[PDB]
Amino acid sequence: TFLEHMCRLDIDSPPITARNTGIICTIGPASRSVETLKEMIKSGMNVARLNFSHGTHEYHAETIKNVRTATESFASDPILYRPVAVALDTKGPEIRTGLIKGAEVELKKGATLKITLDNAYMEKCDENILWLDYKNICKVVEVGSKIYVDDGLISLQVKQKGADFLVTEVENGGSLGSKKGVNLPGAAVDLPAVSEKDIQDLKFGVEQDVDMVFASFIRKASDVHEVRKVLGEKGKNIKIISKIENHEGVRRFDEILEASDGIMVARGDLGIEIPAEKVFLAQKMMIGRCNRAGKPVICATQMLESMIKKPRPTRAEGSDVANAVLDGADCIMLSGETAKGDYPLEAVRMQHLIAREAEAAIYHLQLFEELRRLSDPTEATAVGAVEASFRCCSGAIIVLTKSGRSAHQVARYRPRAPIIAVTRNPQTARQAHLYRGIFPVLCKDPVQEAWAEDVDLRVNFAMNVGKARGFFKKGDVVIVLTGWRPGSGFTNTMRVVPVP
Amino acid sequence: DTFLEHMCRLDIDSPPITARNTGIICTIGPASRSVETLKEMIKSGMNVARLNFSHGTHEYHAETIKNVRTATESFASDPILYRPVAVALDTKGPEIRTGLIKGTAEVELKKGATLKITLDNAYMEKCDENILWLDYKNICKVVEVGSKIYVDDGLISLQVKQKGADFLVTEVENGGSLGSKKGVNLPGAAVDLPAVSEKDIQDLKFGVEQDVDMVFASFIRKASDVHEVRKVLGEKGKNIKIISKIENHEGVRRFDEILEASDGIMVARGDLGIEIPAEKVFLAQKMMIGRCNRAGKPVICATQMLESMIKKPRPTRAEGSDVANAVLDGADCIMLSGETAKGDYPLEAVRMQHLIAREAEAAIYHLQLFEELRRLAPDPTEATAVGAVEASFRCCSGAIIVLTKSGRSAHQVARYRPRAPIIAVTRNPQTARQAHLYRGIFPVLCKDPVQEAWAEDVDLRVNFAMNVGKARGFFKKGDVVIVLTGWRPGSGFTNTMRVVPVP
Amino acid sequence: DTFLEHMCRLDIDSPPITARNTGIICTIGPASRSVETLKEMIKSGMNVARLNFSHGTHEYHAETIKNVRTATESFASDPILYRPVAVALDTKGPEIRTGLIKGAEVELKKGATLKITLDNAYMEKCDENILWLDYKNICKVVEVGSKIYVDDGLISLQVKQKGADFLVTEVENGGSLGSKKGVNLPDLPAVSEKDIQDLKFGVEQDVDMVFASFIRKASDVHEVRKVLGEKGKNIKIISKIENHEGVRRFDEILEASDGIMVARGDLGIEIPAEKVFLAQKMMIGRCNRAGKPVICATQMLESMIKKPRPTRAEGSDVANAVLDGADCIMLSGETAKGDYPLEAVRMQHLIAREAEAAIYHLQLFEELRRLAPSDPTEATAVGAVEASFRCCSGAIIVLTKSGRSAHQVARYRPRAPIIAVTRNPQTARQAHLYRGIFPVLCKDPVQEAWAEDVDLRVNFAMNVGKARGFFKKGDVVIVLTGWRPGSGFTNTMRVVPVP
Amino acid sequence: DTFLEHMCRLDIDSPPITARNTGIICTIGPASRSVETLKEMIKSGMNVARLNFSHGTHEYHAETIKNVRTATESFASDPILYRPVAVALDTKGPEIRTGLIKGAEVELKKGATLKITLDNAYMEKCDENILWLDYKNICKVVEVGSKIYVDDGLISLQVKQKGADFLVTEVENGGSLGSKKGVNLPDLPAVSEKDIQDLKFGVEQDVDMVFASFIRKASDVHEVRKVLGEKGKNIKIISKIENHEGVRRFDEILEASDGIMVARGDLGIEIPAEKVFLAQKMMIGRCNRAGKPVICATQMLESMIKKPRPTRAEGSDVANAVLDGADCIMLSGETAKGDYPLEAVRMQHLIAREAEAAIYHLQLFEELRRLTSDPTEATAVGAVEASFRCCSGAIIVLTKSGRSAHQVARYRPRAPIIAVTRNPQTARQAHLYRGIFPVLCKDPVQEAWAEDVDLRVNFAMNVGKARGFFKKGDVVIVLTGWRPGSGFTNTMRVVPVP
Ligand SMILES: [K+]
Ligand SMILES: [K+]
Ligand SMILES: [K+]
Ligand SMILES: [K+]
């Protein structure tokens, strides 16, 4: 029972399980160097995120170079080599105010504010007529519609809508500077999914051979397909992860999920748009549907922010990170903790520890029996493999895959046993980190002419990796998923093999 | 139908429908001890008022208790709408405390700065940036060089650099604003203070005379600590519930024996974080809540709930998330501290707590709780309790109505955690107040005189329970309720279950 | 724990220590009419006395009923040990029978030629040449190659000439022909003139149930119901399914009836042998689902008509009927006219008790609990059976007036016996139709205080349960009652220790 | 969903669309001896031919075996439609019989007298008074008042006196005392000198299985095993449970046997009639639990010896045996000496097929599943799980000894198990297992292993399509090894039907 699982949790016993959730780290000035990156990889970093909200293409190109230099420095031993994915995080559409002749002119709880659109009234914002770059703001806003300014600092409330201006009352005021960020809860923002700057960044991402794109501010399915279109044919194999940052994204989550390769839950941005007594519900909902759909869900923002200045996180942060894992998140993303903080290596190590500790609180058998309660030969084989992995108490499930799909298919049923995905495709090896329980392995050996010899070679390689990682030892039993004939593109073959 | 589907169907646009089942415990202080404000807190959902005996005199607390009962009984004219309010005494216990600053504000401690700790009573009111006084006289022989000292709920951490015969020289590791009379923790040290001091005895006796409903025993490290508290309360306070506060590592280590000796448990997450690493505290919380749920004893989550509401009218998303997960872990009650005691928005804190708790109810997967609690569990009264919860799921009952004198039979039903609310009908004002400790129990106080005929008296109390249920929106005409009683008057045990239609 | 393991743990060397739960119905005749024999049959386990109204006058049957009640009430001195005995009237129905033979037995020789006359000039001079049967419109509904059966399907004939007057056949096979023997044609009135008289005689004699023969549709049951009328509205109607049409329209027959009797012997005449076991399983299944009694009859222990012990095939066939979910087993000639009626009853008791060891109770309930269609009484019924398993209770005690509440508990098939306590003598007798109900007749006067009267009846059930060995001091039992005097619900459940 | 719903859904006007999963064993005698008749019995559904060595000479049985094989191989020209037919040897065992009748039959009426003699001069003349039997030790195991049954329990006797070389009895139950009839007494050796010779003959005739009569204990089975020896080590030994001791010591017998035959008739004489059904259900359950074949025999369709159709009760008796969980049903006199041997086989086929509709397949499996680190066992379970999950038309198992097909069969999948083998003996022996449909592959071994696997699988595909098990578009489960000549059948493949 799940209750008994909680009762025998022991804080004095070390985590005997391996970490199954991926760790995504934002690379910046504090972690940009090869030497630091090497230690972060050793500490458990699986994906390197590039925040294109700031920095030039030159800067980021150097960062990508350093990440790959640090990564390939472990290639001298393919058994212990861990693939590292590169993630591009788009800037996305913003709503910014004008320049207060910078400086600030405070407001107060009661006064009025006449929002404008005069494209020359930029350089001088008062405590009355305020400017913003959102041209079509007057047809997606209503009367009574709140307008948060500077990350949920100053809330307004529309009173009069002309045709290209708004009269507002200041709900709660304070300091207000230049080029601040405004949020419109819960309006349907009509800004383009792909800014002209995003089109540049995404183009750059294709040339840099990035593995995935974190698309900011996704509100609908058509936004995702717009990013897809920009990536085009050349970037068709790049995984698109939609970032849910506002109320519309939550409401239209199903169409966004069906259009995406994965989901990022941005709690911080969510907390600005919707009340605090509901954000946890939205998180648990979105994670649940991603798990049900077998698509990767990333939990981001406000993970270990205190570790920017401290070597140790608060227990609240540790509890929040742990509960995200227990919710069913596939990956956890660090931001300023690794980008600009004083302890980037400690943050990665702490995230590893918390993820490992939360593993003990996971009730593996229940999740599978529910995901099974919810035709195709590959689906039956995947279910059969997981079922067999519980029956034999297997040390691992070895999946021979080209694109990664066969491994993802097994991963969606959440077996206790780690999934060793063996591939010769370096990209799918890197992209596999997005899925919980998948331990990607990159085979470098040339193809054998005899198909059964090539399979046996890939299996034995996985066998060696498993022994080295301590997943299993000789005498144990593993489940092996392959195809049947040379280049028949569907995994329908399950094999229960003793560990040699 | 499945836990996964249950999570998938969660909707933030949908208004929270079902009632709030977890208790709300509020610490009363300068910001909330007036009759006027107390009335608003009760309206907003306060079930239990906590008296913090770490501060204040007996006449101070007697006034608070009087104000609570005045505010509570102001609603007593309408027994259908009347909500019982419990009074909790939180003992001081083996505390170590600073340390009065000058002549009423604070000083700033900066990183890497030298700070001297003294035991010289000539400095007990002249503490500052350089010298600091505390009341633990044996501190120099329980602490070593390199020992960590935490001040004011772990806000400030110090490291001992030099051991003097009567003093300590420290270096500030974590800076901050030190105030007056703040708590001190010595994680690795073995503090010599007793579980029940002479001051605590005076306080517990005061609690008996003031007819408090429960005692929150601070810093419980073992079973014998609970037996001491139980002993002081004696025969006169034999019905006062004892809640043991787990605040350190030894308390977690010896949790099983403390739980068996106690009536309930309070998990102090904040104090726990001092001795236990951040990557392990959440495990400890889930463990203790689980064993409490298993034993059928109330568990309270306290400290670090809505602390930001001390200065802001709205909590952070992280706080609301942390509160909700405590409820989802299986906590029976949530306790508020500085939010209601001294903060600027005590009314807003209680309302937000009610709002978070109610929203969290939507994420609770009720049937699995019961199905597991029935399979892995250790009596006609017990079989009746299980059967009643069974029927409540089977019939989709609006409520389980339990006619109880001591509250026991209602507690036994609560252990199995039905989805339907448990309306405990009692004529005992004390068990009505104590019932708030248990999740899903909605205590109701019948003041009607005992009817001559027993069956007539039962129907009277059931009719009272159904009126309450209708008024609270638990059920309506045409619904079905489960009723638990004994057989014949003066019956020893509740072994009778009835399925009755709502007229 | 599982069904398979339950079968694996079966032990023929261990005494059947469970109580017999299936009702025993005995056909009373010249071999069992006497008060002495009836007394012993009651002691041996007879629950219901069946009177076959296909033969005998009302004078004869009134005497048989009187003897049954004399034997039954001879045990009334001890209310704790008194077992109620029901009386069943079995109608003749639309029977087609032959005529008497001149002198008397003749042999219908295999391959011969018979002539079915409809003229009353050969009704007393039948032989191997010309045969008479009491059916008129036989030449209005038949082809020239059909089959006709004699002596309960024993002899078979092949019609090869028609017209209107007679029928010319050929003996495919046969044996012996007595006189006025059963004839089968694989639209007589459902309730004939004679049936109406017998049914009204049944109301006058205060019989507990009626076994309606040859029910083919729901309107047949309604007609029987109509004849019984207001005076006999509480009399149970058990519809006998004896042909193919009864099987096809079984659903409407079941809904209209109070119970069902599966006549396997007659069923085999029309339906192929390879199909009858399926029909039996289907009908018993739908009866259990609907919560209505199903009786298995005919071809039970027929060998015991002349022998003191049955064959193993008969024991297996009876046991399987019980294991199929039958509520009652009916004996015919074994008790009516046979040389060992007392041994037949005892053997029936023996087999039914041994078969209980193979009953897997939990699965029956779990499936019924999941299949069953806000009623306080129905919810209490489920909860009581569920609590009986959980507490391993020795019995479920049900205080009932009409028997309905006890019937609702019986539907869920608890392993524990259901002690139905009643003051109504008829409900006590009719309760035997339901598997697992041990009816008990309280004769103590009504106490002034309702609660005290409930305690008295429960206490009476306690004493019966102890004397029967259902439970003992210290055990736990479930008790189902109403809440106040004149309650329309049996919605109150108690878990009470045995005093 | 529920067994109850499954029963309520039974419909007698709906034709049995499913195939017969239970094996049919037929006793061959003077009525079914000919090649022509045997051909019709094979087409009607006979899977196993039983030879009763209680009667007849070796050469008589040698000709029967030749005829059975001539009839079976007449269908060999079509590998896809060809059905393997097993040969079973049923030993005489420790049985005691009566002598010859002077005349011929004499009449023994209830309430008479009878002289049971050891006079060898009266083993030719056993009339109304005198009768001869071949058990010399008869006056050492029978008391005064002991009961004696003759000819399958037809006639019973009461011992009043105990003479020297004879007995004085009292006819308790009447009947017609025929000749060479069997006699029951509710110390003859487990295997006799005759049995030793008969078992040797069985090894020489290459029979597939031995029905060992009157097995009482484990040491009886191993005595038979030892006689069969090295040369007959692959011959299946099925122990016949015919008395109380066999039932009491059933576990040790089952653990020593390859299979079990439940002889209800012989059980009925020894054990009370109100207990035999319990014994039958217990033994079948334990065999199912152990994954060992159980045969229900005796008193099946006896009325079909003289009639073209069975009675209602016999149809219910056979059907309930199938529903009890019996792997095979055996016919005796109905096929051996009766007037309607062909009709007996066809009726047995019809009843077995009709009973199939009453089986809730998922219930048996879910119980057996929870009632291993061994890869072959895990693969076997997984294959059955997949067959339910995919609603597979069949489970194709490539097997050499049959062992792999057997462990899949233990879990009782709804889908037929197509056992593909090149070993003709395992093809014949596979008939003992419920749900196994054996096929004999005759294509020569291909050089490349993956090619030879595909050849065997495609053969199973064509058999399945010809039999109507499945059609193009459906999905089947396939169990194989991984490399040429391997120890474990540990490979499971979910493959579409071309
Ligand atoms: K960004
Ligand atoms: K305190
Ligand atoms: K009749
Ligand atoms: K034999």
Numbering used by the authors:
A (entry chain D): 25 to 126, 130 to 401, 406 to 531
B (entry chain A): 24 to 126, 129 to 403, 407 to 531
C (entry chain B): 24 to 126, 130 to 212, 217 to 403, 406 to 531
D (entry chain C): 24 to 126, 130 to 212, 217 to 401, 405 to 531
Please give sentences taken from the publication describing this entry.
Pyruvate kinase isoform M2 (PKM2) converts phosphoenolpyruvate (PEP) to pyruvate and plays an important role in cancer metabolism. In contrast, PKM2 has low basal activity and is activated by an effector molecule fructose 1,6-bisphosphate (FBP). PKM2 exists in a dynamic population of monomer, dimer and tetramer and its pyruvate kinase activity relies on the formation of the tetramer. Upon formation of the tetramer, PKM2 can adopt the inactive T-state or active R-state conformation.
K422R, a patient-derived mutation of PKM2, favors a stable, inactive T-state tetramer because of strong intermolecular interactions. Different from PKM2Oxalate or PKM2K305Q, PKM2K422R adopts a T-state conformation in the absence of FBP and an R-state conformation in the presence of FBP. Compared to PKM2Phe, PKM2K422R has two additional hydrogen bonds between residue K422R on α15 on monomer C and E418 on α15 on monomer D, which may lead to the dissociation of helices α14 on monomer C and helices α15 on monomer D, and therefore strengthen intermolecular interactions (α15 on monomer C and α15 on monomer D) on the C-C′ interface to facilitate the T-state tetramer formation. The strong intermolecular interactions on the C-C′ interface in PKM2K422R may be difficult to disrupt by PEP to form an R-state conformation. The above structural analyses support the observations that PKM2K422R forms a less active tetramer in solution (compared to PKM2WT) but is stable in the thermal-shift assay. In contrast, PKM2K422R significantly decreased the enzymatic activity (kcat/Km of 0.2) and substrate binding affinity only in the absence of FBP. In contrast, PKM2K305Q tended to form a monomer whereas PKM2K422R mainly formed a tetramer in the absence of FBP. For example, in the absence of FBP, PKM2K422R showed a significantly high level of tetramer formation, but was much less active than PKM2WT. Interestingly, PKM2K422R tends not to form the R-state conformation in the absence of FBP because the hydrogen bonds between residues K422R on monomer A and E418 on monomer B on the C-C’ interface favor a stable T-state tetramer formation. Thus, PKM2K422R shows low activity and high cooperativity in the absence of FBP but comparable activity to that of PKM2WT in the presence of FBP.
